Subunit: 114 residues, 3 copies
C-alpha cells in the first residue's frame, strides 16, 4: 500500500527513522513485506483546520481492492498514536483518509529502459 502524510510540522521536527518506523508498522499490520510498501511524508506545508494553523496532519492510505471498512478503524488504531506522538500533533488534529487503488493500473519501472 501507499501511506501519505501531509503536515505543517517543520521538516527538522520529523524524527530520524520515522519513515522506517511507519513502513515497519504497516508491514506489521498487513503482514506484507516492506518491499512493496511506499510512504510519503510531506512537511513544511501551510495547513489549517478551522482556521487554526496549529500542528496538524492530513493523511491518506491507498491499498488494493478494499482492505478497509472496519480495517479502516484498525488502521486508525494502529497509526494515529504513532503519528500524533512522533510528529508532536494533537490526536484530534490528525486525519486519515482511506482510498481504494485500481489493481489493474500498472506502474512502470524505468530500469526496463534508460
Amino acid at each position: 500500500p501507499m501511506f501519505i502524510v501531509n503536515t505543517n510540522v517543520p521538516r527538522a521536527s520529523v524524527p530520524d527513522g520515522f519513515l522506517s518506523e511507519l513502513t515497519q508498522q504497516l508491514a506489521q499490520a498487513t503482514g506484507k513485506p516492506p518491499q512493496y510498501i511506499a510512504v510519503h511524508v510531506v512537511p513544511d506545508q501551510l495547513m489549517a483546520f478551522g482556521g487554526s494553523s496549529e500542528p496538524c496532519a492530513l493523511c491518506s492510505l491507498h491499498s488494493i481492492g478494499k482492505i478497509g471498512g472496519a480495517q479502516n478503524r484498525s488502521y486508525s488504531k494502529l497509526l494515529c498514536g504513532l503519528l500524533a506522538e512522533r510528529l508532536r500533533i494533537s490526536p484530534d488534529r490528525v486525519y486519515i483518509n482511506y482510498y481504494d487503488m485500481n489493481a489493474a493500473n500498472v506502474g512502470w519501472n524505468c530500469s526496463t529502459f534508460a
Copy 2:
C-alpha cells in the same frame, strides 16, 4: 470541505493570514462553519503550463454532495487567490470534486 492549493510561489511570499481568509471565504461559499473547513496550501512547487514557469496555482475543492455551484465558487475564490498570491488570474485553475462518503476523513482523537 477540503481546499488544496498547489503553487510555485515561495512560502515566504504567502501572506500571513491567508489561511484564515481562505477559510472564511470557503465558509461563505459552502455555507458551512469554519470548523469543518480544511485548507492546504503547497508552496515552492516546480510548476509549468502554457509554456511558462511564471507564478501559477492549480487548486481543488473536495466536498460531500453541479456546474452552477462550481461557477459561483470560482467567482468567490479566484480574486482572492490571484490577488493574495500575486498570480495572474489566467494562471489560476480550480477543479471541483464530489467526495465519496465511503470513505471520509477519520479523526484520531478517538483512537491511539
Copy 3:
C-alpha cells in the same frame, strides 16, 4: 496532459530548464503542442520506497484517452532516461503510472472571474 513528479530529491538539485525539457519531451510523447503540457514537480518529500530512502521519483501522467499498454511503454521509453539522468536517480527507483483523465472534470480558469 498533466505530469506529476514526486521526488525526495532536493528542490535545489533540480537542474535549470528541467521543466522546459520535460515539457518538450512530453509534447513529443503525447503529440500535443508544448503549450498544452502541464508539469508539476514536487521535490523535498520524505520518501521511503522499497524500504529505501535513497533518491527516487514516483511519477504520474494524466491525459484524456484510453489507457493502452503499448502507448504507456513508448511513454516510458521517452521519459525514463530523462528523469533518471536529470534528477540523478537510479532508473530502478523511477516509476511512472498512467491515468485516464475524466473529460467531464472541468478545470475552471480564473481569468473569467478575475
